Write a protein that binds this ligand. Structure first.
Ligand code: CLA
Ligand code: CLA
Ligand code: CLA
Ligand code: CLA
Ligand code: CLA
Ligand code: CLA
Ligand code: CLA
Ligand code: CLA
Ligand SMILES: CCCCCCCCCCCCCCCC(=O)OC[C@H](COP(=O)(O)OC[C@@H](O)CO)OC(=O)CCCCCCCCCCCCCCC
Ligand SMILES: CC1=C(C/C=C(\C)CCC[C@H](C)CCC[C@H](C)CCCC(C)C)C(=O)c2ccccc2C1=O
Ligand SMILES: CC1=C(C/C=C(\C)CCC[C@H](C)CCC[C@H](C)CCCC(C)C)C(=O)c2ccccc2C1=O
Lengths: 157, 743, 73, 80, 30, 143, 88, 42
């Protein structure tokens, strides 16, 4: 009995299967993250990603920033997280513009791990990527706003 | 399977015939030189035995006798140190007044002006101050007269002769059989129980009969000439009994298990003796006794000829699990076959040991009047750090030589090694990431502090007064050590080391010995620097080992050897793919890591530890406690450490320390000299040499041994050798001038 | 660095990094348009000479101007 | 792809082909030396430019030459 | 007042636009 | 006249547990390689990428990422063992290109059906100076 | 089989390892909400222009209207100007 | 014996003997005629 096996049975594809890679807990969790919802409209997945990340970025900017100890503007240091959402959204946009042309099909895999034919994720299309970028921007600005809306009754404001 | 003495008679004839045939060991080199490259190869291959012959028995015999040669040299060197201690030392005057006199064991001849190096060391003695530490050893050993040092030098010389003789004897007369070497259980049993055990026990004997009493008379202020000779304590037990009453019993409490009655001279007090500033000799003798018992027990683990005990192969094979397959199966065959494998493990563990020694000797000064001699302490710590780091890089080199030369899955397979090789890309990729993360989040914090301090924002720095990064874990640990005596070590009177326990500052001759070492944001940042540098060294070396066989760039790399310059400009360029070049690259990073470590030691010890103490107990540290506020910034290292503490070595001209000024500049010179080799390449040099050769043929003075530029690999080796020598000797001169002047 | 370390070391290292990126979830959603390789041999000579020279000039300029202007005399 | 050429100083010892790690070179018949064979580089699109062939040539001067040229995935030795 | 406009203009906006644009030109395929 | 043996899929592959050294996206979108050989028995051999694998008795098929890996392993199969090998290039369309041994004869053995490529009929020192091919697309060694 | 010249995606491991392929767990009305509101940002060129000009003018605004209570550079020196080594 | 003289004729050994003699000579000359920036005998 051995825990490590080749990836999907093929020992000459360069990888391995471990509790870290192929595990029911891990496979379910990764499968239930927005990026891995291949049939969903990329705009909604971008909404979720942007909401989570934009919400996250507020913390370090406010607590570690230069105005951190001037509580009058230190709280308002969330503008910086907003600006980073802007810059990241630029990076996404030029990534898609550079990566996908107008009429090209998805570059995502069209097979499953078990060999059956799959429909490829539209995220890897020019239109799908543009939708994911718009969703990440909207959700990101929105998540920053939501985090900034809560200044109260938290052990680390 | 019956362990026994096995040798062969007269395998190699003692003759000068091959003394006269240079390169006799190599079939190619023995043909002599057509070009100058020959001369270098003769020296690079001289000790590469498994390249001279493929017979394991011959290789083992060469290795064995060579070890005898090494031990002969070591005994000759010790003979030198004791003889200079007897004939050219102020050791008796120092033995009277240790806190004032400076130890000096070398005197120079008055030829060319150099007699200035014979400085005032006290005791009416002119000479060079020594930082090795032999005076504190000799005092701790009860040695009083120069005569005793003479006798030790003569014995050491005799043992040099005996070791040399045994080397010649076991290579040319009685040369052990290969089965004799491979008897690993016998060897481990005899080195655990026989060498380490009986050695520690013998030393405990000398200490309880010589070191303890003579040090009692020294500590009681008795004049060393008036102290009874060490054997008078063995003869008349009344001398010892007056000093240590337990000796009136006649070792009856030892057999009757009344051992508690020996708590007189066998003690667990811990801490430091406040008179000498060194560890309690009672604790040390007790220590060597306990160690002796432990090793004497450990030496019965392995089975030999009487059925009881362990076979190591059995132990290995039983250890396997669901993640590692059949692991450990095959390692007994590898470790009884490959010398380079054994040398790899032993270099790793011996170097790591040397570093641990470096820490434990400063934090627990074992010899009397050693802690307060800051030149000797700094010298010892720095020295052993260097030895350790070098030895570890060697361990990488020989792991690589094993992988290239002795690894064969069709013959001597191991599951663990195969699996590692089977995810080498994952291992090295993750180590790479950790190195980048550590670089940013250790050194990038320094850059953050320099930038904030330059912009006039010290409140935005990482500091004990701004954004604190406290080493909470280490602080909690040293607190727990401070609370240990009486609680989790009720037998321990005081703290394990004065760096732990609060209070109990120890001062000797007005100078401090040890006090509690504080820890703060500065120490945090530095420690993550050490983590970073070590991780990058490990990255270079481990990457060198795991991809020595092959890689995606070069599938047949093992066929190119362990030491080769490249596989050419193709595939984008493949320079320095060899495992050798990974050792070459890792040497620089061992230099970087160890350099920052010893700078951290000097800086921290002068700032927060060493210094003078008032009659009323006010401590003035050599530097003004400026570690916490000045080390958290690179500019602070440049200014308050390098620029400040280099004043002694650049001001040493005209004194007895001027040799350290000369070595400062000269080591700078050889370090810069290395950059010629490291930054260039042999094609340029060979072309230039073509023009020079033309000039010689013009005057009929071109040599037959055709001049050639160094090989690519030799260019690298020369380069790294001079880089390391220059840097290390520069820090050497810097340290010794600094701490000899201000210590 | 660029003057003492030569290329093959970095090329193999970058191969391990390519493996790392392709086998990391979420990140392998992102693909490079240009195959990451180690700098060329000559290119490293140039890059290292440029760092050596920029550091040379900027170091001596800082010392020159600060040491003179600080005194102005 | 790197250019690789053979010159009629070739003596047909076959060592360039034996050294090549990507099989770029062949031995073809020829009447100009005693070995009656000369090297050839019909597969330079696989040439990685390591110059093991040049290290292998005994002719003074060389009879194989590798002129490193336009880089490709194959010439850069990329497995990715 | 003017430096508060042109320092971020040439130190933030101009490098972002130039880097993005050059990125596009450099990644283009004809 | 030589007929290249066609690549037979369903040919067994060596016994091996998998490694990080194997194929990547390059094999999916660009090209990969396949080496086949005949073994007299089950043997252990060193993989050009991972660690150790078990060569199977009979026909063996092994997909590798680069041509040089095929030629390295084949060199060893011919050297350590005494095994005939062939290998091919495989494009993502399924098309196969036989590569080696190109003639059915190893290239270090002169075979008469071989045509000269890149052969210049002059000493290397007789190449012209760059100035003589300047502004022309040519290189002095292309002649 | 693990080698098939007909299907190279399977042969070269071209799979979606963690792709779910399940239907939307996002309920509608939420979906239509974000689909109608994030729609203007789904044209990548237009979004690029809106981000560069919007973020650029935003930056220009907070830079032009910054207060000395936030930036020492607007506050200016508040101390009497010192005297140079030999000069002003 | 012949082989030992041969070994003593080898480059490094002949070099140590030669430069050791030269060093003793120069040392003794600087012992009887120390300092000296010039050739004073004219
Ligand atoms: C005492 C006389 C003696 C004689 C005549 C020989 C004769 C021979 N020996 Mg033996 N041997 C001797 C003593 C002797 N040995 C001793 C004392 C040892 C223990 C170390 C050995 C161990 C030994 C081994 C392991 C081997 C030989 C080998 C050989 C043969 C090769 C020739 C040779 O050794 O050239 C060598 C000439 C030298 C000058 C060697 C000098 C090495 C010294 C010890 C190093 C000194 C260290 C130095 C101080 C470092 C500081 C440098 C600093 C100044 C920069 C040769 C016939 C080799 C063999 O079998 O050939 C195939 C072989 O492998 N011998
Ligand atoms: C070409 C030499 C040169 C150099 C090295 C500088 C350097 C500098 N200028 Mg100046 N400037 C220049 C020419 C130059 N300037 C000219 C000809 C004008 C018009 C009269 C200005 C008007 C100007 C203003 C109003 C301001 C600066 C400011 C500054 C400082 C901050 C940088 C900045 O805001 O962007 C520079 C802004 C510009 C408008 C420069 C562009 C002017 C011409 C058309 C340059 C051509 C640019 C072209 C599109 C790209 C060519 C690349 C390069 C070769 C110029 C900086 C030290 C700011 C300052 O003082 O901060 C404290 C500031 O507010 N500059
Ligand atoms: C050369 C141009 C340049 C300029 C003009 C600035 C300007 C600024 N920097 Mg930056 N920086 C630069 C280069 C520059 N930096 C470079 C090259 C580096 C790499 C070493 C850094 C790294 C750096 C760090 C680490 C930090 C700064 C910070 C700051 C801010 C400190 C003053 C402050 O507290 O304001 C006010 C403080 C605020 C939080 C207000 C936020 C400003 C809003 C969000 C502007 C909106 C941005 C806009 C929408 C998007 C911009 C992209 C655009 C082109 C589309 C300031 C606005 C600090 C900072 O930003 O705090 C988090 C800080 O942490 N800088
Ligand atoms: C209790 C028995 C004993 C002792 C004390 C030693 C001691 C030592 N061995 Mg050994 N060895 C032993 C048994 C023993 N061995 C057995 C059973 C085997 C397997 C058959 C080996 C095989 C072995 C190998 C292959 C090597 C060693 C080596 C060493 C030295 C390691 C370096 C060191 O620690 O220097 C410390 C120095 C001292 C402690 C000075 C005291 C040394 C005295 C003179 C020797 C005492 C033990 C000796 C074996 C007695 C025999 C002498 C008699 C036959 C004439 C060391 C002196 C290395 C070596 O040979 O170095 C030259 C090495 O290569 N040992
Ligand atoms: C007990 C430990 C130990 C042992 C027995 C060995 C044994 C061996 N090593 Mg290893 N190694 C070690 C430690 C050790 N090494 C350490 C600490 C390092 C890190 C530097 C290395 C790194 C290493 C590398 C990279 C290589 C070896 C190689 C070898 C083999 C060839 C030795 C030789 O003939 O060189 C001959 C010895 C010399 C030419 C002496 C050179 C002079 C040095 C460079 C200068 C010393 C400076 C001096 C101390 C200070 C200035 C004085 C001066 C001014 C007079 C040999 C079997 C080589 C090999 O090919 O393996 C098969 C090889 O490539 N080792
Ligand atoms: C001071 C000189 C120097 C520097 C800066 C480095 C830097 C580095 N080396 Mg190198 N090295 C050097 C000398 C140097 N080396 C020399 C002389 C040699 C010859 C022996 C080598 C040989 C060597 C080897 C063999 C290896 C390295 C490795 C590494 C990397 C370690 C990982 C890391 O810390 O990432 C973090 C980066 C840093 C700590 C650098 C400073 C980062 C700054 C402070 C952050 C600033 C960012 C800021 C936003 C900039 C943006 C501004 C904008 C205008 C662009 C690192 C980037 C190892 C590696 O590949 O990495 C795993 C590796 O294996 N080095
Ligand atoms: C948490 C770490 C820790 C550490 C490193 C130590 C370390 C030590 N303890 Mg200990 N001890 C601890 C926890 C710890 N203790 C705690 C939490 C308690 C309860 C408060 C004790 C209570 C305790 C007592 C009563 C004694 C020690 C003693 C000792 C010393 C001798 C060890 C010994 O007795 O042999 C091993 C003892 C065994 C029962 C065999 C266990 C095998 C171990 C795991 C190996 C030793 C230095 C002895 C002492 O004071 O020495 C002077 C002693 O008498 N300790
Ligand atoms: C090219 C560089 C150079 C030159 C021109 C000199 C020149 C001199 N040095 Mg200096 N020196 C140098 C480099 C140099 N040195 C270096 C690199 C070092 C460090 C190692 C030293 C360290 C040094 C010291 C410590 C001393 C000198 C001294 C001297 C003087 C000794 C004259 C003498 O020996 O009497 C005359 C010698 C002879 C006539 C011998 C020639 C006769 C031959 C052997 C036989 C002729 C037969 C017919 C001399 C003028 C000594 C001195 O007193 O300075 C004034 C002295 O104390 N040197
Ligand atoms: C030491 C702690 C390491 C715990 C490993 C956990 C552990 O011991 O697991 C042990 C695990 C169990 O293996 P087996 O049960 O097969 O072992 C049985 C035989 O090999 C021994 O007889 O081995 C592995 O998981 C393979 C190693 C992969 C793990 C690689 C991760 C490496 C990262 C470690 C660095 C981070 C922490 C550094 C702090 C110093
Ligand atoms: C300077 C340099 C050289 C030239 C250096 C050489 C050739 C060193 C050899 C010089 C010594 C002095 C030759 C030894 C001469 C004999 C010892 C005879 C001396 C006569 C008496 C004085 C003993 C290289 O060959 C080289 C190769 C690869 C990378 C970098 C470099 C490099 O930087
Ligand atoms: C570190 C190192 C690398 C690795 C370094 C690489 C791959 C460069 C990575 C660059 C990254 C992308 C950041 C570069 C940032 C630059 C400061 C930005 C300049 C870009 C424009 C201004 C042109 C080599 O490839 C190499 C090759 C040959 C000899 C020595 C070395 C060598 O030392």
């Amino acid at each position: 009995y051995q825990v490590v096996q080749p990836i999907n049975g093929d020992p000459f594809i360069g990888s391995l299967e471990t509790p870290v890679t192929s595990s029911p807990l891990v496979a379910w969790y990764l499968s239930n993250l927005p990026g891995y919802r291949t049939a969903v409209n990329p705009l909604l997945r971008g909404i979720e990603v942007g909401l989570a990340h934009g919400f996250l970025l507020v913390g370090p900017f406010v607590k570690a920033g230069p105005l951190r100890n001037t509580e009058i503007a230190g709280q308002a240091g969330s503008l910086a997280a907003g600006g980073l959402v802007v810059i990241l959204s630029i990076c996404l946009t030029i990534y898609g513009i550079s990566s996908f042309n107008e009429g090209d099909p998805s570059t995502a895999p069209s097979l499953t791990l078990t060999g059956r034919k799959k429909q490829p994720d539209q995220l890897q299309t020019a239109d799908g990527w543009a939708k994911f970028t718009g969703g990440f921007f909207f959700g990101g600005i929105s998540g920053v706003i939501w985090a900034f809306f809560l200044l109260y009754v938290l052990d680390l404001p | 399977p019956e362990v026994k003495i096995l040798v062969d008679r007269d395998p190699i004839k003692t003759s000068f015939e091959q003394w006269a045939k240079p390169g006799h060991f190599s079939r190619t080199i023995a043909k002599g030189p057509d070009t100058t490259t020959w001369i270098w190869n003769l020296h690079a291959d001289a000790h590469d035995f498994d390249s001279h012959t493929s017979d394991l028995e011959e290789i083992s015999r060469k290795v064995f006798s060579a070890h005898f040669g090494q031990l002969s040299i070591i005994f000759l060197w010790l003979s030198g140190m004791y003889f200079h201690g007897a004939r050219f030392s102020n050791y008796e005057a120092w033995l009277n007044d240790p806190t004032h006199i400076r130890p000096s064991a070398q005197v120079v001849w008055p030829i060319v002006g150099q007699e200035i190096l014979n400085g005032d060391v006290g005791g009416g003695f002119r000479g060079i101050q020594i930082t090795s530490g032999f005076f504190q050893i000799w005092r701790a050993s009860g040695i009083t007269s120069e005569l005793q040092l003479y006798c030790t030098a003569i014995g050491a010389l005799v043992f040099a002769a005996l070791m040399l003789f045994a080397g010649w004897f076991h290579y040319h007369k009685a040369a052990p059989k290969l089965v004799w070497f491979q008897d690993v259980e016998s060897m481990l049993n005899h080195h655990l129980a026989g060498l380490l055990g009986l050695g520690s026990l013998s030393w405990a004997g000398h200490q309880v009969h010589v070191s303890l009493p003579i040090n009692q008379f020294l500590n009681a202020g008795v004049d060393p000439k008036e102290i009874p000779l060490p054997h008078e304590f063995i003869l008349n037990r009344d001398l010892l009994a007056q000093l240590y009453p337990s000796f009136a019993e006649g070792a009856t409490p030892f057999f009757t298990l009344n051992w508690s009655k020996y708590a007189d001279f066998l003690t667990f007090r811990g801490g430091l003796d406040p008179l000498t500033g060194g560890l309690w000799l009672t604790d040390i003798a007790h220590h060597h006794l306990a160690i002796a018992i432990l090793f004497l027990i450990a030496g019965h683990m392995y089975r030999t000829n009487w059925g009881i005990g362990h076979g190591i192969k059995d132990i290995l094979e039983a250890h396997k699990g669901p993640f590692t397959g059949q692991g450990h199966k095959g390692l007994y065959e590898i470790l009884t076959t490959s010398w380079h494998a054994q040398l790899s493990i032993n270099l790793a563990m011996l170097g790591s040991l040397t570093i641990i020694v470096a820490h434990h000797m400063y934090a627990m000064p074992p010899y009397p009047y050693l802690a307060t001699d800051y030149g000797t302490q700094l010298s010892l710590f720095t020295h052993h750090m260097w030895i350790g780091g070098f030895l570890i890089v060697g361990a990488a080199a020989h792991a690589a030589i094993f992988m290239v030369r002795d690894y064969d899955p069709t013959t001597r397979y191991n599951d663990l090694l195969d699996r590692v090789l089977r995810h080498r890309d994952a291992i090295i990729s993750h180590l790479n990431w950790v190195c980048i993360f550590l670089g940013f989040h250790s050194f990038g914090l320094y850059i953050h502090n320099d930038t904030m301090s330059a912009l006039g924002r010290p409140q935005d720095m990482f500091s004990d007064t701004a954004i604190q990064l406290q080493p909470v874990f280490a602080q909690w640990i040293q607190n727990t050590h401070a609370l240990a005596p009486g609680t989790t070590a009720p037998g321990a009177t005081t703290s394990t080391s004065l760096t732990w326990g609060g209070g109990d500052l120890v001062s000797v001759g007005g100078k401090v010995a040890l006090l509690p070492i504080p820890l703060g944001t500065a120490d945090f940042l530095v420690h993550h620097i050490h983590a970073f540098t070590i991780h990058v060294t490990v990255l270079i070396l481990l990457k060198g080992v795991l991809f020595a066989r092959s890689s995606r760039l070069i599938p047949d790399k093992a066929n190119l050897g362990f030491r080769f310059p490249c596989d050419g400009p193709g595939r984008g360029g493949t320079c320095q793919v060899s495992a050798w070049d990974h050792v070459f690259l890792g040497l620089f990073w061992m230099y970087n890591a160890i350099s920052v470590v010893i700078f951290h030691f000097s800086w921290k010890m002068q700032s927060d530890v060493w210094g003078s103490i008032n009659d009323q107990g006010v401590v003035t540290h050599i530097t003004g406690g400026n570690f916490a506020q000045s080390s958290i910034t690179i500019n602070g290292w440049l200014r308050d450490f390098l620029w400040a503490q280099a004043s002694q070595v650049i001001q040493s001209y005209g004194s007895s320390l001027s040799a350290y000024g000369l070595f400062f500049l000269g080591a700078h010179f050889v370090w810069a000299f290395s950059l010629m080799f490291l930054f260039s390449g042999r094609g340029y040099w060979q072309e230039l040499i073509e023009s020079i050769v033309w000039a010689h043929n013009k005057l009929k003075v071109a040599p037959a041994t055709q001049p050639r530029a160094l090989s690519i690999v030799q260019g690298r080796a020369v380069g790294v050798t001079h880089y390391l020598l220059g840097g290390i000797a520069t820090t050497w001169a810097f340290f010794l001038a600094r701490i000899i002047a201000v210590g | 660095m660029f003057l003492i370390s030569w290329r093959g070391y970095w090329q193999e290292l970058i191969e391990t990094l390519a493996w790392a990126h392709e086998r990391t979830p979420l990140a392998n959603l992102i693909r490079w348009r240009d195959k990451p390789v180690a700098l060329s041999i000559v290119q490293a000579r140039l890059v290292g000479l440029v760092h050596f020279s920029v550091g040379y000039i900027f170091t001596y300029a800082a010392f020159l101007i600060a040491s003179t202007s600080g005194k102005f005399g | 792809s790197h250019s690789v050429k053979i010159y009629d100083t070739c003596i047909g010892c076959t060592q360039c082909v034996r050294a090549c790690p990507t099989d770029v070179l062949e031995m073809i018949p020829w009447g100009g030396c005693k070995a009656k064979q000369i090297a050839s580089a019909p597969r330079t699109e696989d040439c990685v430019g390591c110059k093991r062939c040049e290290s292998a040539c005994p002719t003074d001067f060389l009879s194989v030459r590798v002129y490193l040229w336009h880089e490709t995935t194959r010439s850069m030795g990329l497995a990715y | 007042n003017l430096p508060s406009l042109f320092v971020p203009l040439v130190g933030l906006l101009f490098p972002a636009v130039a880097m993005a644009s050059l990125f596009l030109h450099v990644e283009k395929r004809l | 006249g030589f007929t290249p043996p066609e690549l037979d899929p369903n040919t067994p592959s060596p016994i091996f547990g998998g490694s990080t050294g194997g194929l990547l996206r390059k094999a999916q979108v660009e090209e990969f390689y396949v080496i086949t050989w005949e073994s007299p028995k089950e043997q252990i051999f060193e993989m050009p990428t991972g660690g150790a694998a078990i060569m199977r008795e009979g026909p063996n098929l092994l997909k590798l990422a680069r041509k040089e890996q095929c030629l390295a392993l084949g060199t060893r199969l011919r050297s350590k063992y005494k095994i005939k090998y062939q290998f091919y290039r495989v494009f993502p369309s399924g098309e196969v290109q036989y590569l080696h041994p190109k003639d059915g004869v190893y290239p270090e053995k002169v075979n008469p059906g071989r045509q000269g490529v890149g052969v210049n009929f002059r000493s290397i020192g007789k190449n012209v100076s760059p100035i003589e091919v300047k502004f022309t697309g040519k290189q002095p060694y292309d002649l | 089989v693990y080698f098939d010249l007909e299907d190279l995606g399977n042969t070269t491991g071209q799979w979606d390892l963690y792709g779910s392929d399940a239907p939307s767990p996002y309920n509608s009305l939420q979906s239509k909400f974000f689909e109608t509101f994030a729609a203007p940002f789904t044209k990548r060129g237009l979004l690029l222009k809106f981000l560069i000009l919007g973020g650029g003018s935003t930056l220009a605004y907070f830079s032009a209207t910054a207060s000395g209570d936030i930036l020492p550079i607007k506050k200016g020196p508040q101390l009497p100007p010192q005297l140079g080594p030999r000069l002003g | 014996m012949r082989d030992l003289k041969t070994y003593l004729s080898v480059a490094p050994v002949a070099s140590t003997l030669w430069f050791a003699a030269l060093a003793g000579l120069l040392i003794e000359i600087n012992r009887f005629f120390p300092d000296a920036l010039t050739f004073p005998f004219f």
